[PDB]
Amino acid sequence: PVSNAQLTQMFEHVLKLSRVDETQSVAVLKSHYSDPRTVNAAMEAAQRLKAKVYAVELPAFNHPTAMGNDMTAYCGDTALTGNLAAQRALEAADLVVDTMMLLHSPEQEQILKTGTRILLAVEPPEVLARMLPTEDDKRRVLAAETLLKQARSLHVRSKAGSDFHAPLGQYPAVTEYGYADEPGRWDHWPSGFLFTWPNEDSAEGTLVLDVGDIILPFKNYCRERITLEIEKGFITGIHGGFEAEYLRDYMKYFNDPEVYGISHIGWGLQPRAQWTAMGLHDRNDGMCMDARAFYGNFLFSTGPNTEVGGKRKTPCHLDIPLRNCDIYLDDKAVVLAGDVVAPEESRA
Amino acid sequence: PVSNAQLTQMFEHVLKLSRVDETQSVAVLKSHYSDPRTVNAAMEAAQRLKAKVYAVELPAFNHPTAMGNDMTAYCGDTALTGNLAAQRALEAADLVVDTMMLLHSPEQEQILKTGTRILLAVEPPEVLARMLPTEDDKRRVLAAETLLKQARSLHVRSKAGSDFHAPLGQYPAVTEYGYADEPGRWDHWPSGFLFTWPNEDSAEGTLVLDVGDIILPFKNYCRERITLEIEKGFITGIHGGFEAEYLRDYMKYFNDPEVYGISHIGWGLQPRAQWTAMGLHDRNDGMCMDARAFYGNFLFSTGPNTEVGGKRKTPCHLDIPLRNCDIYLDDKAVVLAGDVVAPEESRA
Amino acid sequence: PVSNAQLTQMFEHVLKLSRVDETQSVAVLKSHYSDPRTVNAAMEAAQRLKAKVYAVELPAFNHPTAMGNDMTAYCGDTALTGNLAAQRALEAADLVVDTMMLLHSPEQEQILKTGTRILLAVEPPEVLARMLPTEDDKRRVLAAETLLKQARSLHVRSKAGSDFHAPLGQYPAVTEYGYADEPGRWDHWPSGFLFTWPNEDSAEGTLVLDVGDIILPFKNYCRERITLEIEKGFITGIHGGFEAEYLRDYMKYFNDPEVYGISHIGWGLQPRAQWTAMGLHDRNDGMCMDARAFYGNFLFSTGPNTEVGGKRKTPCHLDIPLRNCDIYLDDKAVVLAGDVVAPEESRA
Amino acid sequence: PVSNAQLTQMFEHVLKLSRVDETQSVAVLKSHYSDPRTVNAAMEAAQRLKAKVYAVELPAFNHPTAMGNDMTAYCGDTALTGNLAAQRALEAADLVVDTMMLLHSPEQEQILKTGTRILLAVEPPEVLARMLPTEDDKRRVLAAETLLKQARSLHVRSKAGSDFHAPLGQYPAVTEYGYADEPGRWDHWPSGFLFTWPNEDSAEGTLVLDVGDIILPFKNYCRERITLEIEKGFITGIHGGFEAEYLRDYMKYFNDPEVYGISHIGWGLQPRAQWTAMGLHDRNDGMCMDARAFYGNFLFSTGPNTEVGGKRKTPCHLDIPLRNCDIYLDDKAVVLAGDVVAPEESRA
Amino acid sequence: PVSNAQLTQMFEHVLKLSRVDETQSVAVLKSHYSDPRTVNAAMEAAQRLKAKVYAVELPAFNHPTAMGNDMTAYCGDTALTGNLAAQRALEAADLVVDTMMLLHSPEQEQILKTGTRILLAVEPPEVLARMLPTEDDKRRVLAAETLLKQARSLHVRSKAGSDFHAPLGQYPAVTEYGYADEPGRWDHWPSGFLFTWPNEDSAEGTLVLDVGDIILPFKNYCRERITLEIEKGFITGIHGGFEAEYLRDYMKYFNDPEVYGISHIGWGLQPRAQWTAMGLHDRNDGMCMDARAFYGNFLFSTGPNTEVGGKRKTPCHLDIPLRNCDIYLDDKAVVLAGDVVAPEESRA
Ligand SMILES: [Fe+2]
Ligand SMILES: [Fe+2]
Ligand SMILES: [Fe+2]
Ligand SMILES: [Fe+2]
Ligand SMILES: [Fe+2]
């Protein structure tokens, strides 16, 4: 496990990648459920770097109908909703270290528009250490982003039956390489992947969760196939066995035809993340960045897309990584058999 | 002692009086030595009144030459010094509950300029409860403020031989009545007194700390007399037995002529405070507002007066109340033999 | 200092002397200011002795006019006042270990009348170790109780000028030897002393606090004499220096003629208690049993006497032990020059 | 659940069995993630038994590539690696109570070589209570050991297709009956099993994880068979469905030919342990001793064997218990179809 | 006050000066009453410096007849008495940080002989910060040592009547400058003074505690004179008013002629320490090193000399600083009227 001393050094390293120094101000955002060791370590490390530091504690926000303890599960209001003073208290800072899992909101977007950069850190210390950010990871992620911002279409195929096409261009590319160096940037330690959104009402085809593919926030390896039929950017059929029914039942509870929209789409670039990791953790350890980010996955998502000016504001939200896919941007393959093949600069 | 329910209720009471309601944002300012029960009662109470809330934690500021644990003793920089983001974090709020004892500073003056209010609350709960603030305390204190602002001169006599003159006018009256209701106001729960400052280089005569008179932050009842000789606003001679030598040596330590300057002067109007209270407490219990505010005391101060655009910025600061004094504003007496006599409204 | 293991062992010892075993039920009474180590040790110890145990936590009770943190200083309502259910929950136990300092009250007296026995234990572990109860202390105390119950009068002389006479007979003798073995008995770990009360309206003479004598809760060694003139069981004069005036001032604040009545009178039998102990502690640490029980002191008290059916229910309460006294019961001396001389079985 | 009282009494029981008394010294070894309750109980029980005690605290060691929070998952360096002084601090003691799970390493082996004995205690209190050690467990486990030390080979068959042969003799037999009574002896509260290692480069045949069989540290009951093919001490083939792919992925990650080596082999003799227990626990709750020690299991392990001078020093370590097995020493059955049949004195 | 951050940084400074780096082992010694912030800060700082570290926790040891919570007040056995394993646990290390105040004893001396060095650090962080150790301080203190090791006699005179003489030479001089750089060396952060002991049975004359002088551990400033008459290295008479009677009573209580022995003698060389500091603190804040080390004091002690193989191992230990003294080595002044005059290289 990770000692207190190692944990402050890790924060020293990541904050330094994030351009924290004596000119900079750091605000550590926490609530009752924040990991006190991580908060502590972020406060000490920041002070070691000569930054001006303060913590901001907000009362937790609860969505009454939300289930489980993964907060990515229900995308709605946040602790900042209606608390304009606290938001200003965070805008005042250059860098916010977020340990309370503030969700994407117009309130957060307003923080980012002032130049403030935000670094999310909520995984346990041990996950943090295995996926400790590097500049190499930034270069690789950015090489891939260049290639994605020039793409007009995205195609996914798998031997299991995925055949999925997504026109692009209408929306930007997002990257997460694990540190918050550039102003107005949000990032997450740990990460190491990229995505965009399909043009509105256009994503078509079928996506097949094979045996061994994952649905978050359920955090299970599927034991039977689920076939998703998608038309004009919405899931219209969900088929297969017990997982299929559990999925169908879970999406129905939200009682909203918006849950079925396809939101982000992208691939993983983090070789230190492992598909097997999730099997060694409890549900309540964290949100499982290993599943999201592992090298050569295809990650797609359902539900809200308000983050980029999409129509959908629904709380239901799934992230589903697929193994063993072939992924194509226009004519060219970025991933083949779940091995990353292009750009050459993006490869491990 | 004071339970958690009673503490919360007392903070509801004082925050009501400080005009906290649903239109308001409260910031609870704290550091690692803040009492957690007090912080939690303030946060809970503010939410009961439907105000938005957040807590602000700052790292402790240490002045390396300072002695004791009393923070009034050493007036220098503070954790706000060069820490604008932190200051903006407080400025966001309508009302700051200070549980860390931020000392008067240009940075704090800026906060009040914006219209933000500051309530200091750091004494132990039992003390807080005994001097719970009232609208009647404000009335009486504000009645005294009227008289004081007109006054051209202050004069103090005692049978023990105090004979002290101070010319007024050049500097404002300042009140403390225990709550922060007006915009840009600072007050301290608990309090109930007022002071001003004498004209530059002008104060003249002798002050005698009789047997039983008090020096803060030493927190001793004097057992022998201390005679202080004052020329052109400065102490030039300190005479007596052991307390005098103890006092001279304390002042010498600071190695600075600024320490001998007289700062605020004024009288106490808090009948629920008690001169005997100090001898039932330890030093580190707090700063002993009972000695400062007890009804009919004369309280004068030394050292820094940059608070009001004075020349002196030195850390060394004593507050000294005296019993059994007659105090005269111009020709008219406020206190006679330690009893408040004028204004009538201001009496108990 | 005392380790956790040694503290549980000490409690095992005292609870064994208090006749705790597998037939008995023990309730540990605590509130938020209770020493958690002592509570934990009481709970562990009782369970080691196979007793059935539980803890009762009450919300603290504050007297709004009370000053300081010692609770013997203000005798009025308690946490049990108005809380019949909690009282009953205490009544169910055979033995209550009180770690919250429940003052004597009608509710407590009712707990005692059900057979329930109560042991107070609030002093720090180190004082508790030093004055760990023995059977031999009980023997010595009871032998003095035998003598005191036959007494028709008590007389106190001292070279410093004490000359005090009190008829007895009207009221019982109370003993404290530091454990709670008999049903319906209250006792206090640590102690080792006994007292009674003088017949109503009858105590006459002078008691002189010599240099070095103590007033509780002030917890000072007197540096100047205070002379107490007493007539028909009331102090009618208090003369001397600063201590005199401080005492006069303190008693006045209560605005109650009753504070000046003489309540209990007795002597100490605890050689392991030391008159010097007090100047090695802080006011916060405890209520100072060393001062009340030290061998050969004459201890007297002012204020309430509703404990024994007296007229006075006032909150002001002093305990004042005097060194170097001769104490006579009828014509027979029990203490001479602060040394215990009779009964022979009560001596060290 | 288990109280503090009970937990301490369990440590007394176990420490006594482990021959702790007034002649002995106990070091309680710990880190930031140790259960403080277990620590305190070990400390206090050691003092109740009159031993001299201290605790040693090491800062935690993280293997940057390790996953999950079970420390049996990565057997590499430990917090003792290069910390010679800490090693000597543990060598000073007669008995180390290990509450941090010190992996078997050259440093621990050395400690044991000084005569120091070590008792591992890291399972949750309830698990500790369910498998509280007995002298009778020791007898049954020693009776089995006799037969193991007499064997020239070990053979496992099962209806599912296990057909596995292991020449014995090169390496010694090791027992675990739950307490550390003998000098230089390491044991684990709880346990109740025994094992040895096969001769170098010799183990042959196949081992079949049937439905219901367990891989540690994954902590799953397999839903599909996995077949392990073994040649000359090494797994050379892993076949089945999803469990098999996952397993293969996990072993490959470590990128070491060494992970594939068969290490210890043996059977379970703890009837208080239970194959079903694991499905009643979360992954972070413990290491799952139930799964390792249950009566009649066959337990084999992969990876490192430097414990006993074997060539392999790798981190990847699996323990795999198999149900329903026929286990033979030479030609003689010690277990048939998961029931223990010989020796008779080893049986329930 | 001092933040965690700052406190960690101070320990780096101090441990660097104590020559801690990658080659060294640091052991941090503690007990249940050790300040955890200080413990953490020391553990952290030694890691930041690449040292190997562990903590050793000893259960607290309590001398049943000890009074108060200053541990210098009773120098008998310690928590290491009889605990050889723990002593070895500490000898294993190159540098021990003592956060529990191991008293001087045959065990602590033995540790030091193995070449292990020791740094005591128990004063509150704020104090630690005010007298932060410097190389210059060492320079000044070794200069004074030079002088003292040459001296054949020490003589103290004061206007108040001190007239005291002590042959030197039988025993070594000892320095304390704040850091433990040399192997075999004990020091204390904070300090800055030096002392030796007088030849057996030889110190003669009178030492007068004037008004303003201090007795440790009573931690009072004397209000009346106490006169100590000294013959053949023992106090034979103690005279004055109330303080003298108190002191006599305190000494008698231990019932041991060895308490009256004159032990170390010397003077203070620390200008950042202040004679007034003590009056700003509470008894349980620390041991008042300000009072022991202030520049120009003469400090003498009573009770045990066993540390140097002296005859007396009694627990009653007093430390007594006098101001305004002339101190002479042979016939030359090192101090006059409480100001240090030789050697010139020791002056501030
Ligand atoms: Fe998503
Ligand atoms: Fe002031
Ligand atoms: Fe009383
Ligand atoms: Fe294993
Ligand atoms: Fe000493």
Short mmCIF file of all heavy atoms in Angstrom, two decimals, chain A residues 1-2 37 126 129-130 211-212 221 223 274-276 279-282 285 323, chain D residues 32 60-62 64 66-69 224 242-243 245-246 249 253 282-284:
data_model
loop_
_atom_site.label_atom_id
_atom_site.label_comp_id
_atom_site.label_asym_id
_atom_site.label_seq_id
_atom_site.Cartn_x
_atom_site.Cartn_y
_atom_site.Cartn_z
N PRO A 1 0.83 -1.22 0.00
CA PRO A 1 0.00 0.00 0.00
C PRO A 1 0.85 1.25 0.00
O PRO A 1 2.07 1.12 -0.04
CB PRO A 1 -0.79 -0.11 1.29
CG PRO A 1 -0.92 -1.58 1.51
CD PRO A 1 0.40 -2.17 1.03
N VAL A 2 0.23 2.43 0.02
CA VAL A 2 1.00 3.65 -0.19
C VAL A 2 1.08 4.39 1.11
O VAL A 2 0.05 4.66 1.69
CB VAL A 2 0.44 4.56 -1.31
CG1 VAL A 2 1.23 5.85 -1.37
CG2 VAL A 2 0.57 3.89 -2.66
N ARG A 37 -6.57 11.32 3.70
CA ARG A 37 -5.16 11.17 3.42
C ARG A 37 -4.82 11.90 2.11
O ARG A 37 -3.82 12.60 2.02
CB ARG A 37 -4.81 9.68 3.32
CG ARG A 37 -4.91 8.92 4.65
CD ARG A 37 -4.56 7.45 4.52
NE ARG A 37 -3.12 7.27 4.27
CZ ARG A 37 -2.59 6.59 3.25
NH1 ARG A 37 -3.34 5.94 2.37
NH2 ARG A 37 -1.28 6.52 3.14
N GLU A 126 -3.31 3.59 -4.22
CA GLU A 126 -2.63 2.51 -4.92
C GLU A 126 -2.87 2.59 -6.41
O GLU A 126 -2.00 2.26 -7.21
CB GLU A 126 -3.12 1.16 -4.40
CG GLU A 126 -2.72 0.88 -2.95
CD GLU A 126 -3.46 1.71 -1.90
OE1 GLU A 126 -4.68 1.96 -2.09
OE2 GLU A 126 -2.81 2.12 -0.89
N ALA A 129 -0.88 5.35 -7.78
CA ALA A 129 0.56 5.13 -7.94
C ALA A 129 0.83 4.37 -9.23
O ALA A 129 1.70 4.73 -10.04
CB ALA A 129 1.11 4.40 -6.71
N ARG A 130 0.03 3.34 -9.48
CA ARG A 130 0.22 2.53 -10.69
C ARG A 130 0.07 3.37 -11.96
O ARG A 130 0.74 3.14 -12.96
CB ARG A 130 -0.81 1.38 -10.64
CG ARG A 130 -0.76 0.34 -11.77
CD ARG A 130 -1.35 -1.01 -11.33
NE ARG A 130 -2.72 -0.91 -10.78
CZ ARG A 130 -3.80 -0.58 -11.50
NH1 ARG A 130 -3.70 -0.35 -12.82
NH2 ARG A 130 -4.98 -0.49 -10.93
N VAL A 211 -18.65 -11.45 -24.07
CA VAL A 211 -18.25 -12.01 -22.80
C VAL A 211 -16.95 -11.33 -22.41
O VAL A 211 -16.01 -11.28 -23.18
CB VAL A 211 -18.03 -13.53 -22.88
CG1 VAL A 211 -17.51 -14.05 -21.54
CG2 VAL A 211 -19.32 -14.27 -23.28
N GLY A 212 -16.91 -10.75 -21.22
CA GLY A 212 -15.70 -10.15 -20.71
C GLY A 212 -15.66 -8.67 -20.87
O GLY A 212 -14.72 -8.03 -20.42
N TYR A 221 -17.87 -7.98 -15.35
CA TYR A 221 -17.47 -8.57 -16.58
C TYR A 221 -18.71 -9.31 -17.06
O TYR A 221 -19.24 -10.17 -16.34
CB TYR A 221 -16.33 -9.55 -16.36
CG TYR A 221 -15.06 -8.92 -15.87
CD1 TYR A 221 -14.75 -8.88 -14.51
CD2 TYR A 221 -14.18 -8.34 -16.75
CE1 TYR A 221 -13.58 -8.29 -14.07
CE2 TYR A 221 -13.03 -7.74 -16.31
CZ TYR A 221 -12.71 -7.73 -14.97
OH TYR A 221 -11.52 -7.13 -14.57
N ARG A 223 -20.95 -12.01 -18.58
CA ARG A 223 -20.84 -13.45 -18.76
C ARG A 223 -21.64 -13.98 -19.95
O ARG A 223 -21.39 -15.11 -20.41
CB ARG A 223 -21.27 -14.18 -17.47
CG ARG A 223 -20.44 -13.81 -16.24
CD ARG A 223 -18.94 -13.97 -16.53
NE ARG A 223 -18.65 -15.33 -17.00
CZ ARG A 223 -18.05 -16.28 -16.27
NH1 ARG A 223 -17.64 -16.02 -15.03
NH2 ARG A 223 -17.87 -17.49 -16.78
N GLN A 274 -5.22 -1.84 -16.71
CA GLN A 274 -5.42 -3.24 -17.04
C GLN A 274 -6.90 -3.65 -17.00
O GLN A 274 -7.61 -3.35 -16.07
CB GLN A 274 -4.70 -4.12 -16.00
CG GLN A 274 -3.19 -4.13 -16.11
CD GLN A 274 -2.77 -4.68 -17.42
OE1 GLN A 274 -2.95 -5.87 -17.67
NE2 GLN A 274 -2.23 -3.84 -18.29
N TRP A 275 -7.32 -4.42 -17.99
CA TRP A 275 -8.65 -4.88 -18.06
C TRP A 275 -9.02 -5.77 -16.88
O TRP A 275 -10.19 -5.77 -16.39
CB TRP A 275 -8.82 -5.58 -19.41
CG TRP A 275 -9.98 -6.44 -19.50
CD1 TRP A 275 -11.27 -6.06 -19.64
CD2 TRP A 275 -9.98 -7.85 -19.46
NE1 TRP A 275 -12.08 -7.15 -19.72
CE2 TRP A 275 -11.30 -8.27 -19.61
CE3 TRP A 275 -8.96 -8.81 -19.40
CZ2 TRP A 275 -11.66 -9.61 -19.64
CZ3 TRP A 275 -9.31 -10.16 -19.42
CH2 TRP A 275 -10.65 -10.54 -19.54
N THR A 276 -8.04 -6.51 -16.40
CA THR A 276 -8.23 -7.39 -15.23
C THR A 276 -8.32 -6.67 -13.91
O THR A 276 -8.67 -7.28 -12.90
CB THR A 276 -7.06 -8.35 -15.07
OG1 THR A 276 -5.85 -7.58 -15.01
CG2 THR A 276 -7.02 -9.32 -16.26
N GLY A 279 -11.56 -6.63 -11.45
CA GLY A 279 -11.86 -7.90 -10.75
C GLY A 279 -11.21 -8.00 -9.37
O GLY A 279 -11.57 -8.88 -8.59
N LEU A 280 -10.27 -7.11 -9.05
CA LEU A 280 -9.51 -7.18 -7.79
C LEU A 280 -9.93 -6.10 -6.83
O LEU A 280 -9.30 -5.90 -5.81
CB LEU A 280 -8.01 -7.05 -8.06
CG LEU A 280 -7.44 -8.16 -8.94
CD1 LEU A 280 -6.17 -7.68 -9.62
CD2 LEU A 280 -7.19 -9.40 -8.09
N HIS A 281 -10.99 -5.38 -7.18
CA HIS A 281 -11.46 -4.27 -6.36
C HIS A 281 -12.89 -4.46 -5.96
O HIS A 281 -13.65 -5.22 -6.62
CB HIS A 281 -11.28 -2.95 -7.12
CG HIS A 281 -9.85 -2.54 -7.23
ND1 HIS A 281 -9.18 -1.91 -6.21
CD2 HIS A 281 -8.95 -2.73 -8.22
CE1 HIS A 281 -7.93 -1.69 -6.58
NE2 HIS A 281 -7.76 -2.18 -7.80
N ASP A 282 -13.25 -3.81 -4.86
CA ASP A 282 -14.65 -3.71 -4.48
C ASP A 282 -15.30 -2.59 -5.27
O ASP A 282 -14.62 -1.66 -5.70
CB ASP A 282 -14.81 -3.45 -2.97
CG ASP A 282 -14.73 -4.73 -2.14
OD1 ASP A 282 -15.02 -5.84 -2.67
OD2 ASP A 282 -14.40 -4.59 -0.95
N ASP A 285 -14.55 0.96 -3.94
CA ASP A 285 -13.18 1.46 -3.95
C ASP A 285 -13.13 2.77 -4.72
O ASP A 285 -12.63 3.78 -4.22
CB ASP A 285 -12.23 0.44 -4.56
CG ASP A 285 -12.03 -0.76 -3.67
OD1 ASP A 285 -12.38 -0.67 -2.47
OD2 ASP A 285 -11.54 -1.80 -4.16
N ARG A 323 -13.39 -4.69 -25.54
CA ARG A 323 -12.09 -5.29 -25.90
C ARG A 323 -12.11 -5.77 -27.37
O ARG A 323 -13.19 -5.90 -27.98
CB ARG A 323 -11.83 -6.54 -25.04
CG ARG A 323 -11.05 -6.34 -23.80
CD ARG A 323 -11.32 -7.46 -22.82
NE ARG A 323 -11.04 -8.83 -23.29
CZ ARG A 323 -9.81 -9.32 -23.47
NH1 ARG A 323 -8.72 -8.56 -23.29
NH2 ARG A 323 -9.65 -10.58 -23.86
N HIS D 32 0.28 1.80 8.62
CA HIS D 32 -0.82 2.76 8.65
C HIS D 32 -2.18 2.05 8.38
O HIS D 32 -3.22 2.41 8.96
CB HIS D 32 -0.55 3.94 7.65
CG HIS D 32 -0.85 3.57 6.22
ND1 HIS D 32 0.12 3.17 5.32
CD2 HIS D 32 -2.03 3.46 5.56
CE1 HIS D 32 -0.44 2.86 4.17
NE2 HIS D 32 -1.75 3.00 4.29
N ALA D 60 4.54 1.96 4.85
CA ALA D 60 4.06 0.99 3.92
C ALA D 60 4.93 1.00 2.68
O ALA D 60 5.51 2.05 2.27
CB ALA D 60 2.60 1.28 3.58
N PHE D 61 5.01 -0.18 2.09
CA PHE D 61 5.72 -0.38 0.85
C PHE D 61 4.73 -0.66 -0.27
O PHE D 61 3.89 -1.54 -0.16
CB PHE D 61 6.69 -1.57 0.95
CG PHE D 61 7.62 -1.65 -0.22
CD1 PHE D 61 8.62 -0.69 -0.39
CD2 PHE D 61 7.47 -2.64 -1.18
CE1 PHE D 61 9.46 -0.73 -1.49
CE2 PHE D 61 8.31 -2.68 -2.28
CZ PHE D 61 9.30 -1.72 -2.43
N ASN D 62 4.85 0.09 -1.35
CA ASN D 62 4.03 -0.13 -2.52
C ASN D 62 4.90 -0.69 -3.64
O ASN D 62 5.99 -0.21 -3.89
CB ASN D 62 3.38 1.17 -2.99
CG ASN D 62 2.17 0.92 -3.89
OD1 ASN D 62 1.28 0.14 -3.57
ND2 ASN D 62 2.15 1.59 -5.01
N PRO D 64 5.00 -0.63 -7.41
CA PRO D 64 4.24 0.29 -8.26
C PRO D 64 3.34 -0.43 -9.28
O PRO D 64 2.31 0.13 -9.67
CB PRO D 64 5.34 1.12 -8.96
CG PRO D 64 6.67 0.56 -8.51
CD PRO D 64 6.39 -0.78 -7.89
N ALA D 66 1.80 -3.54 -8.73
CA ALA D 66 0.78 -4.36 -8.07
C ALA D 66 -0.63 -3.80 -8.26
O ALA D 66 -0.80 -2.58 -8.30
CB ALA D 66 1.07 -4.45 -6.58
N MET D 67 -1.61 -4.71 -8.32
CA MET D 67 -3.04 -4.33 -8.38
C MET D 67 -3.88 -4.90 -7.25
O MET D 67 -3.55 -5.94 -6.66
CB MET D 67 -3.67 -4.78 -9.69
CG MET D 67 -2.74 -4.56 -10.87
SD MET D 67 -3.71 -5.09 -12.48
CE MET D 67 -3.13 -6.93 -12.77
N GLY D 68 -4.99 -4.23 -6.97
CA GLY D 68 -5.85 -4.60 -5.84
C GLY D 68 -5.19 -4.33 -4.49
O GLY D 68 -4.08 -3.80 -4.44
N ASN D 69 -5.87 -4.71 -3.40
CA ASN D 69 -5.36 -4.45 -2.04
C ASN D 69 -5.04 -5.69 -1.19
O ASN D 69 -4.80 -5.57 0.02
CB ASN D 69 -6.35 -3.57 -1.27
CG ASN D 69 -6.79 -2.37 -2.08
OD1 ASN D 69 -5.99 -1.47 -2.37
ND2 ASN D 69 -8.07 -2.34 -2.45
N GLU D 224 -16.92 -21.50 -14.94
CA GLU D 224 -16.52 -22.35 -16.05
C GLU D 224 -15.17 -23.00 -15.68
O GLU D 224 -14.36 -22.38 -14.99
CB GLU D 224 -16.28 -21.52 -17.31
CG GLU D 224 -17.42 -20.63 -17.78
CD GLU D 224 -16.97 -19.65 -18.88
OE1 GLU D 224 -15.80 -19.20 -18.89
OE2 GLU D 224 -17.79 -19.31 -19.75
N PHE D 242 -13.98 -17.94 -19.88
CA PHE D 242 -13.70 -16.55 -19.61
C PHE D 242 -12.74 -16.49 -18.42
O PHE D 242 -11.80 -15.71 -18.40
CB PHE D 242 -14.99 -15.74 -19.37
CG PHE D 242 -14.71 -14.45 -18.70
CD1 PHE D 242 -14.05 -13.46 -19.39
CD2 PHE D 242 -14.93 -14.30 -17.38
CE1 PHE D 242 -13.70 -12.29 -18.77
CE2 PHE D 242 -14.59 -13.13 -16.74
CZ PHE D 242 -13.97 -12.13 -17.45
N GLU D 243 -12.99 -17.32 -17.41
CA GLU D 243 -12.07 -17.40 -16.29
C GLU D 243 -10.65 -17.69 -16.83
O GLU D 243 -9.68 -17.05 -16.40
CB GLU D 243 -12.52 -18.43 -15.24
CG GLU D 243 -13.64 -17.96 -14.30
CD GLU D 243 -15.04 -18.46 -14.69
OE1 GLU D 243 -15.21 -19.01 -15.80
OE2 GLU D 243 -15.97 -18.30 -13.88
N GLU D 245 -9.28 -17.05 -19.90
CA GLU D 245 -8.72 -15.87 -20.55
C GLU D 245 -8.23 -14.82 -19.54
O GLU D 245 -7.13 -14.30 -19.66
CB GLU D 245 -9.76 -15.21 -21.42
CG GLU D 245 -9.27 -13.94 -22.09
CD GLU D 245 -10.12 -13.56 -23.29
OE1 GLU D 245 -11.37 -13.50 -23.14
OE2 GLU D 245 -9.54 -13.33 -24.37
N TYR D 246 -9.08 -14.50 -18.57
CA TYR D 246 -8.77 -13.57 -17.50
C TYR D 246 -7.51 -13.98 -16.75
O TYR D 246 -6.58 -13.20 -16.57
CB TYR D 246 -9.95 -13.56 -16.51
CG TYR D 246 -9.74 -12.60 -15.36
CD1 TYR D 246 -10.32 -11.34 -15.38
CD2 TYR D 246 -8.95 -12.95 -14.25
CE1 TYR D 246 -10.12 -10.43 -14.37
CE2 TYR D 246 -8.75 -12.04 -13.21
CZ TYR D 246 -9.35 -10.77 -13.28
OH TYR D 246 -9.18 -9.82 -12.28
N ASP D 249 -4.47 -13.48 -18.85
CA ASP D 249 -4.16 -12.06 -19.05
C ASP D 249 -3.38 -11.58 -17.85
O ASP D 249 -2.38 -10.93 -17.97
CB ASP D 249 -5.46 -11.25 -19.19
CG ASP D 249 -5.36 -10.09 -20.18
OD1 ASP D 249 -5.29 -10.36 -21.41
OD2 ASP D 249 -5.38 -8.92 -19.71
N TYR D 253 0.64 -10.16 -17.83
CA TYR D 253 0.93 -8.80 -17.37
C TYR D 253 2.26 -8.68 -16.67
O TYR D 253 2.99 -7.71 -16.88
CB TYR D 253 -0.16 -8.34 -16.40
CG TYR D 253 0.13 -7.09 -15.57
CD1 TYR D 253 0.07 -5.82 -16.15
CD2 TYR D 253 0.40 -7.18 -14.20
CE1 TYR D 253 0.28 -4.68 -15.40
CE2 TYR D 253 0.61 -6.05 -13.44
CZ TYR D 253 0.56 -4.79 -14.04
OH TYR D 253 0.78 -3.64 -13.29
N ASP D 282 -16.57 -9.26 1.18
CA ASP D 282 -16.02 -8.39 0.13
C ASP D 282 -14.49 -8.61 0.01
O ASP D 282 -13.83 -8.95 0.97
CB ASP D 282 -16.36 -6.92 0.43
CG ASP D 282 -17.87 -6.62 0.34
OD1 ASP D 282 -18.55 -7.11 -0.58
OD2 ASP D 282 -18.37 -5.85 1.18
N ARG D 283 -13.95 -8.35 -1.17
CA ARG D 283 -12.55 -8.63 -1.51
C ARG D 283 -11.53 -8.00 -0.60
O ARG D 283 -10.48 -8.59 -0.33
CB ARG D 283 -12.22 -8.14 -2.91
CG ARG D 283 -13.29 -8.42 -3.95
CD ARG D 283 -12.77 -8.08 -5.32
NE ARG D 283 -12.95 -9.21 -6.22
CZ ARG D 283 -13.94 -9.35 -7.09
NH1 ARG D 283 -14.86 -8.39 -7.25
NH2 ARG D 283 -14.00 -10.44 -7.85
N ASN D 284 -11.84 -6.79 -0.14
CA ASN D 284 -10.95 -6.06 0.76
C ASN D 284 -11.06 -6.49 2.23
O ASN D 284 -10.29 -6.01 3.06
CB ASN D 284 -11.21 -4.56 0.68
CG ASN D 284 -11.16 -4.04 -0.74
OD1 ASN D 284 -10.25 -4.38 -1.51
ND2 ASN D 284 -12.14 -3.22 -1.10
#
